[PDB]
Design a protein around this nucleic acid. Structure first.
Ligand SMILES: [Mg+2]
Ligand SMILES: [Mg+2]
Ligand SMILES: [Mg+2]
Ligand SMILES: [Mg+2]
Ligand SMILES: [Mg+2]
Ligand SMILES: [Mg+2]
Ligand SMILES: [Mg+2]
Ligand SMILES: [Mg+2]
Ligand SMILES: [Mg+2]
Ligand SMILES: [Mg+2]
Ligand SMILES: [Mg+2]
Ligand SMILES: [Mg+2]
Ligand SMILES: [Mg+2]
Ligand SMILES: [Mg+2]
Ligand SMILES: [Mg+2]
Ligand SMILES: [Mg+2]
Ligand SMILES: [Mg+2]
Ligand SMILES: [Mg+2]
Ligand SMILES: [Mg+2]
Ligand SMILES: [Mg+2]
Ligand SMILES: [Mg+2]
Ligand SMILES: [Mg+2]
Ligand SMILES: [Mg+2]
Ligand SMILES: [Mg+2]
Ligand SMILES: [Mg+2]
Ligand SMILES: [Mg+2]
Ligand SMILES: [Mg+2]
Ligand SMILES: [Mg+2]
Ligand SMILES: [Mg+2]
Ligand SMILES: [Mg+2]
Ligand SMILES: [Mg+2]
Ligand SMILES: [Mg+2]
Ligand SMILES: [Mg+2]
Ligand SMILES: [Mg+2]
Ligand SMILES: [Mg+2]
Ligand SMILES: [Mg+2]
Ligand SMILES: [Mg+2]
Ligand SMILES: [Mg+2]
Ligand SMILES: [Mg+2]
Ligand SMILES: [Mg+2]
Ligand SMILES: [Mg+2]
Ligand SMILES: [Mg+2]
Ligand SMILES: [Mg+2]
Ligand SMILES: [Mg+2]
Ligand SMILES: [Mg+2]
Ligand SMILES: [Mg+2]
Ligand SMILES: [Mg+2]
Ligand SMILES: [Mg+2]
Ligand SMILES: [Mg+2]
Ligand SMILES: [Mg+2]
Ligand SMILES: [Mg+2]
Ligand SMILES: [Mg+2]
Ligand SMILES: [Mg+2]
Ligand SMILES: [Mg+2]
Ligand SMILES: [Mg+2]
Ligand SMILES: [Mg+2]
Ligand SMILES: [Mg+2]
Ligand SMILES: [Mg+2]
Ligand SMILES: [Mg+2]
Ligand SMILES: [Mg+2]
Ligand SMILES: [Mg+2]
Ligand SMILES: [Mg+2]
Ligand SMILES: [Mg+2]
Ligand SMILES: [Mg+2]
Ligand SMILES: [Mg+2]
Ligand SMILES: [Mg+2]
Ligand SMILES: [Mg+2]
Ligand SMILES: [Mg+2]
Ligand SMILES: [Mg+2]
Ligand SMILES: [Mg+2]
Ligand SMILES: [Mg+2]
Ligand SMILES: [Mg+2]
Ligand SMILES: [Mg+2]
Ligand SMILES: [Mg+2]
Ligand SMILES: [Mg+2]
Ligand SMILES: [Mg+2]
Lengths: 64, 96, 81, 52
RNA sequence: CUUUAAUGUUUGAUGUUCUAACGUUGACCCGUAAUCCGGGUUGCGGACAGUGUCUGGUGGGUAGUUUGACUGGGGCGGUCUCCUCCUAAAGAGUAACGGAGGAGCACGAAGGUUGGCUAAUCCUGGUCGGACAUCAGGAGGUUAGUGCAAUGGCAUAAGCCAGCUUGACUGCGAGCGUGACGGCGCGAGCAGGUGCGAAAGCAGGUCAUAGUGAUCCGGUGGUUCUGAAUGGAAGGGCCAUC
RNA sequence: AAUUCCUUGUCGGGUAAGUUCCGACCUGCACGAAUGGCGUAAUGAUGGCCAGGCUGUCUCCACCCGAGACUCAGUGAAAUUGAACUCGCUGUGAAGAUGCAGUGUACCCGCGGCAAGACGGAAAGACCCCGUGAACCUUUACUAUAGCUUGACACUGAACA
RNA sequence: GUUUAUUAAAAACACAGCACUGUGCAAACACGAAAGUGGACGUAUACGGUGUGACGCCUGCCCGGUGCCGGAAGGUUAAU
RNA sequence: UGUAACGGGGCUAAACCAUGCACCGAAGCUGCGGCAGCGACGCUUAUGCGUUGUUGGGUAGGGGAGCGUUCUGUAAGCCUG
RNA sequence: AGGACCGAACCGACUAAUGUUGAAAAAUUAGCGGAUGACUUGUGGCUGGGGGUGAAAGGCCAAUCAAACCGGGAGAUAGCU
RNA sequence: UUUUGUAUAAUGGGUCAGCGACUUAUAUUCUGUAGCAAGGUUAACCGAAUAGGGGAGCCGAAGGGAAACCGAGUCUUAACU
RNA sequence: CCAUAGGUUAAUGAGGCGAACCGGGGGAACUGAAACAUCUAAGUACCCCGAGGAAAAGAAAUCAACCGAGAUUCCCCCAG
């Protein structure tokens, strides 16, 4: 049978041009008045998935 | 994604975005695909007859990728700037 | 004969302070030289002092440790390179 | 944690707001600060509103 | 208009009686050769009761399950996150139910800037006034102070007074530090607009290091980004925030 | 005390001597009045103590009678078992040795006996811990629920106040 | 008298008796999706449950907690 | 339990201290012969051939190369009274 | 007369010894309790598994019971050997 | 076999013979190999039929952004040195 | 009272068995979630009823998207 996609990781990760994955940062959903604006400003843009955790993502997202 | 009982990465991280239904019915076209049609005119029904974009597609852009060596009338499609220059240099006539 | 305890179990995490680039060591502008609590060192030429008394390079070049002033305080400067 | 949280609403008509805390017991009078509004790109007086 | 009566219906509430629903594990007759049942007469009850759907309470009567780990064996006791010092062997880091202490905030000024200032303690003299208030001089030289624990800093003061103020700005960020990762931290400089200062300049919170909580779900404001025939809308997305 | 930890409480009786027994005291760790209190004749294959009789229970065993055991003839198992050319000691060593080291001792093989060792045989320890195991049971653990109960609507109507 | 057939025969269970409490008869209760049946072809001197356990002398104080019973003025409160 | 605190016998050195020359002593090193791996270099590679160094203990585990078995094709072939 | 007495049948099972690969998957021997009663026994019937029954030991329900047996889900699952 | 570690007096095996445990299916990725190559490839099905047809489709040659959209650029931002 | 219920004759048919497939009425739990209750397992196993050689469904109060298609069933894609 076909492999089934982990639908949470499909809602959390997107494959880039060379095969890397972009993702949203954490810590930007609530509790936001005590955090510095510099921290939030460095949390708005999407970041790349690291080399260590890139294997678990590919295992969860077999169909790109 | 099981990390022991540690909270896995696909749940530490937040969901984002939504899915555009219009993107599934949009398509992009090479300049090299413009010669594969017949009649020298390029429509949606011509590209679908040439099996390029697919049946359910309703919108298409032409992008500077590849190169064309023949004058082709483009009708009812968006064209990028570099594809507009390459089509008009090869003799094309972009219209609506 | 069971009993006891230990009110003294705690400690904090190691903050990884110290000198990140030593003398005669070519750095880029913005490179952290020293992380420290106080001003155990002081900022000399082409060296800025951070919010937490962190010494960073404002320019590019070699690190120079030197002792100046009447108090014999230790200054860090960036030589040109 | 008696120091409750509020918001500093722009008086420029925009719904832009800064969020912060105050002791409403010791500072009963309302907070008004002149802050930057990035929509209008001017410094405008903000006034205290509820954090909601 | 205000204030209530008349007549009547729209009608609810509690009685009052009734019979025709319904009940009869009352009597009698027939099916019948039958203590079931059904039909019939009659009597009693009577819209009660009782059943169906919905609903609130009760409900170990029954059922499915949960009831943490470390641990000089387990339980009991204590502990579980964060900061500081020692252990830690002169870079970083480094364990034990090892030795000792703190935090789960505060501040619209206790922030920014400009200007100025410099302590603790003791000695002598001196109204109430005393070991110790305030005042003057002298020694001393930070033994003081730092909103709070400890350590490292602090006189160019980061300590203390006063004036004006809101940079406790928004978008970014070369380059580094630190982590397995999630993440955390420092940051010159750039664009805009601002405050103090004559000006050079400083300011993207506080002398620094604790003062914290992922995701999901949901709420509020803004934004046509999307909008399942089309136009809107709902809902979703993004930004801020709870 | 079927309850008393301290406790073999103290005193008395009984015995040469009595942590038990019986009777008192009360200082009841922590009795107590229908999850009954205190008595109580009779009963009990009931529990504790004492005495008389009796006796191999014993001092301390002796002999005898029979059934096996032993020998012959016939039939003929079993548990167990890595392989065995299967000694002692002191030491060593996965920390208690037939098997290692050193040394001592010992011709080869049976039969009747004993049971000190082979950490002997039997039963994947029941104790203990663990497992994000199971079962049953409990309750003011959680979530449900049968059941009981409340009311609304329906079956369900007519009059009068 | 009874009991752990196969390590426990007892001080354990039962017992006659006592008390509390429910039950008015289509009884309560119990087995049954229900019809029905037992109770009982009985009718409160009866039946069920609970505790105690011949007999003799007795059974003292507490209703605050938890239950149960009774109340219906007020507060709160479901579907509708 | 049996000497039982040099391994024993035994030793007045066959003990200790100092110095010296010998020798024994390992699967170490060297010699001779043989196999394989990986690198050099050159050939003129037939894609492997001289020389050349060096390497070759190994569990979990990773990589490479093989033996043998049954069956199908080759096979109405070959072997076999 | 008697849930009276002694004591065989009969019912039971208090003590000891044997036996424990037994004669026997609970028995024999010597003693023991009840023995006209809440007795015992024959035949047939009824009650069914979260159920029965129980003078109540979690006892018994075909040598099996803190939820029988048989078949099926089913190759349950087993971070354990 | 399990172990830091077993002659271990830790496990297992009386012996022999026979059987006895990393498979299969479909997806996916990587390596090798072979075919074509900016293209490659068909599935169903037809077909007497392992041919040929069939290019529904799939992957790739373009990405960025949540998205509209833009496009070798794009996003962020009023705008980026 | 008629009548009806009921009774009796007569005719026709059914009943029961059987492998799988089919439609329907009921309907688990172990397990997985590294616990578990929502969820899953799974409308699975199982029980019951009925039918045929196949059954079921079936001739648009259907899709579509301003162009159009034209009952039902089945296979490959769409697409994990
Ligand atoms: Mg948000
Ligand atoms: Mg956790
Ligand atoms: Mg329970
Ligand atoms: Mg534990
Ligand atoms: Mg203990
Ligand atoms: Mg160090
Ligand atoms: Mg060191
Ligand atoms: Mg301050
Ligand atoms: Mg100054
Ligand atoms: Mg004075
Ligand atoms: Mg300050
Ligand atoms: Mg501070
Ligand atoms: Mg959640
Ligand atoms: Mg729109
Ligand atoms: Mg619309
Ligand atoms: Mg007591
Ligand atoms: Mg005592
Ligand atoms: Mg005495
Ligand atoms: Mg005695
Ligand atoms: Mg006495
Ligand atoms: Mg008592
Ligand atoms: Mg009482
Ligand atoms: Mg009693
Ligand atoms: Mg013989
Ligand atoms: Mg044998
Ligand atoms: Mg020994
Ligand atoms: Mg012998
Ligand atoms: Mg022996
Ligand atoms: Mg013997
Ligand atoms: Mg043994
Ligand atoms: Mg075991
Ligand atoms: Mg008796
Ligand atoms: Mg008996
Ligand atoms: Mg017994
Ligand atoms: Mg007995
Ligand atoms: Mg009845
Ligand atoms: Mg009693
Ligand atoms: Mg009383
Ligand atoms: Mg009361
Ligand atoms: Mg009440
Ligand atoms: Mg109420
Ligand atoms: Mg010499
Ligand atoms: Mg040699
Ligand atoms: Mg060698
Ligand atoms: Mg050689
Ligand atoms: Mg070697
Ligand atoms: Mg090797
Ligand atoms: Mg290996
Ligand atoms: Mg062959
Ligand atoms: Mg008698
Ligand atoms: Mg007898
Ligand atoms: Mg008798
Ligand atoms: Mg018990
Ligand atoms: Mg049995
Ligand atoms: Mg059962
Ligand atoms: Mg069970
Ligand atoms: Mg299953
Ligand atoms: Mg199994
Ligand atoms: Mg083994
Ligand atoms: Mg072990
Ligand atoms: Mg090992
Ligand atoms: Mg061990
Ligand atoms: Mg050894
Ligand atoms: Mg041995
Ligand atoms: Mg062994
Ligand atoms: Mg073991
Ligand atoms: Mg064995
Ligand atoms: Mg074999
Ligand atoms: Mg594969
Ligand atoms: Mg390939
Ligand atoms: Mg760019
Ligand atoms: Mg389940
Ligand atoms: Mg379960
Ligand atoms: Mg699970
Ligand atoms: Mg049909
Ligand atoms: Mg039309």
């Amino acid at each position: 049978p076909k492999i089934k996609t982990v639908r949470g990781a499909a809602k959390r990760f997107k494959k880039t041009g060379k095969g890397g994955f972009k993702h949203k940062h954490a810590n930007l959903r609530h509790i936001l008045t005590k955090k510095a604006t510099k921290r939030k400003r460095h949390l708005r843009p999407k970041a790349m998935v690291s080399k260590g955790d890139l294997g678990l993502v590919i295992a969860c997202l077999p169909y790109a | 994604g099981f990390e022991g009982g540690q909270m896995p990465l696909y749940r530490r991280l937040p969901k984002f975005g939504f899915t555009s239904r219009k993107a599934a019915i949009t398509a992009e076209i090479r300049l090299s695909d413009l010669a594969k049609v017949e009649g020298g005119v390029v429509d949606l029904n011509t590209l679908k007859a040439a099996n390029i974009i697919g049946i359910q597609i309703e919108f298409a852009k032409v992008i500077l990728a590849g190169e064309v060596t023949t004058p082709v009338t483009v009708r009812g499609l968006r064209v990028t700037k570099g594809a507009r220059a390459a089509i008009e240099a090869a003799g094309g006539k972009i219209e609506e | 004969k069971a009993g006891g305890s230990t009110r003294n179990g705690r400690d904090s995490e190691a903050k990884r302070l110290g000198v990140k680039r030593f003398g005669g060591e070519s750095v880029l502008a913005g490179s952290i030289i020293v992380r420290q609590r106080g001003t155990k060192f002081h900022a000399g030429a082409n060296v800025g002092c951070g919010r937490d008394h962190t010494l960073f390079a404002k320019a590019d070049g070699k690190v120079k440790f030197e002792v100046k002033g009447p108090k014999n305080r230790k200054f860090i400067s960036i030589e040109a390179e | 944690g008696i120091r409750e949280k509020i918001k500093l609403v722009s008086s420029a008509g925009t719904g832009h707001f800064y969020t912060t805390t105050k002791n409403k017991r010791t500072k009963p009078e309302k907070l008004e600060l002149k802050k930057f509004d990035p929509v209008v790109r001017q410094h405008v007086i903000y006034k205290e509103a509820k954090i909601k």
